[PDB]
Amino acid sequence: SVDQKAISTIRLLAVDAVAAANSGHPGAPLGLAPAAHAVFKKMRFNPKDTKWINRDRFVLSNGHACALLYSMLVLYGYDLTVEDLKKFRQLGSKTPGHPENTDVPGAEVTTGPLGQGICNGVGIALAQAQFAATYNKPDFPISDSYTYVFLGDGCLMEGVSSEASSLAGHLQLGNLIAFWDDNKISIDGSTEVAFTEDVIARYKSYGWHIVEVSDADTDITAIAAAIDEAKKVTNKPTLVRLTTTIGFGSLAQGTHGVHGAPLKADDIKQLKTKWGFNPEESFAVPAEVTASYNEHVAENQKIQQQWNELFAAYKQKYPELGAELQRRLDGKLPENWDKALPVYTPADAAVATRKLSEIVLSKIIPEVPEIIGGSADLTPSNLTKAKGTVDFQPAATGLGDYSGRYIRYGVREHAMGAIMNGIAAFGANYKNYGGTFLNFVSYAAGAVRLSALSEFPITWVATHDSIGLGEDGPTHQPIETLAHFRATPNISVWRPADGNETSAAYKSAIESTHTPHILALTRQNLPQLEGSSIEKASKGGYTLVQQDKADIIIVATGSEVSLAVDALKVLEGQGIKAGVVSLPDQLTFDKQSEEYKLSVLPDGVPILSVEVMSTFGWSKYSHQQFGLNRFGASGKAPEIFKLFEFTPEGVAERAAKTVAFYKGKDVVSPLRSAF
Amino acid sequence: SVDQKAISTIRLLAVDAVAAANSGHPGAPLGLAPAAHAVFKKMRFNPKDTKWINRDRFVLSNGHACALLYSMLVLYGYDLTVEDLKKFRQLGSKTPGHPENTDVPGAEVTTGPLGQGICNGVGIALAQAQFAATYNKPDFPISDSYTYVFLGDGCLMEGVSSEASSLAGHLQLGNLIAFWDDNKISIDGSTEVAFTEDVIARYKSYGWHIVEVSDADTDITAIAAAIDEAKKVTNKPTLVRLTTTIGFGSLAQGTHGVHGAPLKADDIKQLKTKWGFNPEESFAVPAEVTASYNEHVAENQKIQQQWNELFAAYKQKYPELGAELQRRLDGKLPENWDKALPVYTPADAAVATRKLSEIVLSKIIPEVPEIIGGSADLTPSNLTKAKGTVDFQPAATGLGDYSGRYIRYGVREHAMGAIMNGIAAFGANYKNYGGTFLNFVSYAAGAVRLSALSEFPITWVATHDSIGLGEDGPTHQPIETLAHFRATPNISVWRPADGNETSAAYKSAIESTHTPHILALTRQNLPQLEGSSIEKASKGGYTLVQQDKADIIIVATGSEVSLAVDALKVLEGQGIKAGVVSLPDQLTFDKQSEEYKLSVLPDGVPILSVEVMSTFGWSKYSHQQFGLNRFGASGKAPEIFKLFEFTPEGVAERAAKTVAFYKGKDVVSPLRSAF
Ligand SMILES: CC1=[N+](Cc2cnc(C)nc2N)CS[C@H]1CCOP(=O)(O)OP(=O)(O)O
Ligand SMILES: CC1=[N+](Cc2cnc(C)nc2N)CS[C@H]1CCOP(=O)(O)OP(=O)(O)O
């Protein structure tokens, strides 16, 4: 049949792509081609408009199987061709070895690191539910799309998927339909060696619906029926168990050897002949398959055409909501939204930056409907919920509504991070955030790195940033954390010192379209600084205290800026004139012009950095570094600062030693380099 | 009764400790005191010998509840007193706000970061099973101890605990007995807001046995009976559901407010009077409670006395095994074990450092019985299994035996990391390792940081270290990873360049007693270097190519050392004389004498670092840094190196620019500093 021919085409495109690269993963593509065919036939999408907001989304969580995804995209006429498939895994191609949303049309997210994609799918589905609850009206199903996820045994072993699956079940996300490639093979061989749990029983325990397809190597009727069944269960996410043979059709089917290396040439020949293809030909695309797939595309395009008319009618019937929706689909924030950002003066009281963050959120959430967010069981500590908002929960629970704006993630940092990526991936200008203690952002490193690689504007509200948290002690006190994330490409790591800097950090985080943000915020109160403003802090680094005859400049962040200002006064009594630079975000600063940066960190003066955590990275901006390169301590925070000499006198002593060390030396800016 | 009085004593010590600190967590201690009393009465331990190898182990995974643990340790006469309890959460005390194994006698592991302790318990139990299988003989139950773990809702939400619980069920770890504090309250309030899964059904799906105790606020008979029942189920770990009231007895019992802040003074008064204590007194220890607990200690000490005689008889009956066991309990490796380390010459073939690692393991595993390890589903990629070894599996599976030495962790990096910590915590000189790709060590950051804080000699075999892995692309290629771990205190991060350096890295990792190791290893082949040796590489950094008239020194690691040597030849043709330093471990290097370090990185010569990942940290050792501060690419590895100019010519160009940049300048070693 044409469907059988399409499945064979998919299988053979994937195998031929792996063969041409002499690299990659043929096994799962062979096993999942029937399911991919069936799912894409049920999906609504436009290959010519990858951003249609009511499209169904597909996520390949087992991203190593991407030759399958690329084959589907090529067959459906996305902006990806057979010539691109021939360049699978080749430098610069549109067909990288794992899918990247920035590079691959039709890749919703970046997968490959196992477990992430299913969590991203949870976030896409969460966003769709929130979006539909916000905009849909009687006779106006603006949003009614599904989220389809393929995942394998490896994703099911990764703890992040357990976190997200528990939460998705709790949230009753009935438009999420996941498909488990139950092939009983991973890299180390049979799943009997390490993965003998009853997966189905576990998913039932989370509140998921289950459909089992016992012969998913051939039974596309049953796969389609499983989708239909899943769509009837509106209050549970569904897991479809696809019992498949890894590498189906290969001489090596059902073995670990077919997972992750190219097939032998003779194996490819026998695949082709038993499926009616020419064993001498590669990258064959039968025109009847193209015709069948084109029919589905044309039908989907007529569905989108009708959706566009529905949207036009919605704008007439609901003028305010329609204009809001249009603005969001255009990627634009509300005009002058930033006038809601709080502004402070040096006469205002000291405030912890976690509390300043609460105040910002309280002002901007009512002004910017596309902001949603939550916390990983730290709501009253991170201060992430605006008073008067309702939680995102299924209304059946009585605990919230899908129109709610605040997500109770539970103690699930890693899944929170990957769910945030999925919310961003949904689109519609969502600007979403997640709170935890800074030290436990590290639990989510796998997802955070993907936020950076995927260019998603997510925000971590990362409170209790240092030894300033005090008594909880060294298991809770960051040392390495900012260095880790600052060393990751494309992460803005804001460590605001005061009220104006906290508003600048949020302005950056909410305006972002391609860069994730981490906001490192204090437990403890900090003074409002003389010289701070949103305008200056928006440059990422700025001169707080200018001293034209400086003997030294002290560059600091966060809680240490006020310390530097106090040290400047001690130094004056020692006959040393200091300037102060505040560096609330190194990435934003780095992006400023060379001339601006040199105005902040000039030649001809020693520069000392002060920040109560690792000194890594700081030599970009300073000649000498005063940091904390050992673990912390359990005690009252002021006593810990005293112990480690992060006091005005301790900073002054090191500043004086720095001045002494450079006597008789020629000093150029740390910004200079040889290449 | 005296048991009731003991439970009240525990509760009130914990509340009084929190009160004195005006900080900490009274709720879970109040709820878990009956269970703690019951469990410690069943446990075999010696407060005067915390390292008795056949002790039962206790782990408080909900580490915020540590006022409970400290109260137990004080009451049982560990080296912790009421005076220490009065200093709970105070700087420098033996009672920090979360338990630290380095600081607290009777704390087996460092907990506080949720989810870790239960995984550590899995590792303690895994080690006990392996140890017993190795040493026990008929009439000689050298090892027969249990592992008791307390955990709460937060631990059950963290994905790492799902990973470890799936694996523990698979491994049939019948001497593991965990207790869930089922109190339905977390920081964000009721668990109904985020955690509605059927936990018991999930644990059954993993193959655990379940016992439910419906009134764990009072029913110590049922808690004791649950332990007895668990001990009869020898082929499943057991989860005991303790249905408790958080803060039991407090006016605020059953509320989130009792989780994490001191009780009100009037609340403490009413607690004391209803339990028969003096509301005017704090830190009361009734002598009858001390007497009862002392009776149990005395019985346990007689059990250990008899174990010592059993061990003496074992040494006579099994002379070889007895001497091996004695050596391990003394903390000593086999005499001259390191003579098994492979040694290479520059005439030997190029080899990937992952393969060199395989060869090391193949030589040392037969020589050092306390080495065990595994991989997170990457055995044929990391090359972590020695041929001829058997896997650690329950014999009932037919897939291995508990005497086996190789662990199939599955796709569970985070749990692998925390399980490794538990294996180390067991003691008996275990030197254990875990393989994954370097980029996915990041999934386990929560546990890795705890390896460092806990001072455990665990080893990550972290292969595929860079863009040198090629086609899998940027989702797999480390950039920030070494900077992250090097910025963490107390992590040795070895990046060996060749065969001799790989042997030095293992010598360090296996000899370690207090420092975790990460071995960053290549996919791709590297040449054997002229000038390398185990002796020199053991210094962490060394002069590979000495040039007395150097215009520049190039410092490099791993795959970039050979690149630097090739660049030296290009530079010679440009009239520039270079030296080369290899820096296989920055931590080990840092620990050398100042004079040694200056002999490697002298004054008076520009120093350029070369390493194909983040430049963070490198200014400790260099004036200029050539690194990779952007994400990678999917293609053949040599083409990626060419793209980023990590070629002999690209390094030479930057070296020449470095020489030019320092013309006319006075250059001092990067090792110099102002303070
Ligand atoms: C272990 C593995 N990798 C390394 C890998 C490890 N850890 C993380 C976080 N991401 C990864 N990418 C890549 S791939 C995988 C086997 C998957 O086994 P799985 O059953 O899902 O795939 P398959 O056999 O094809 O049915
Ligand atoms: C969310 C929380 N903390 C921050 C916290 C967050 N993430 C990680 C990895 N470790 C932590 N330490 C500390 S504590 C916890 C509530 C526990 O809730 P749980 O039900 O286990 O404790 P309890 O209410 O006392 O019954």
Ligand SMILES: [Ca+2]
């Ligand atoms: Ca599989």
Ligand SMILES: [Ca+2]
């Ligand atoms: Ca709880």
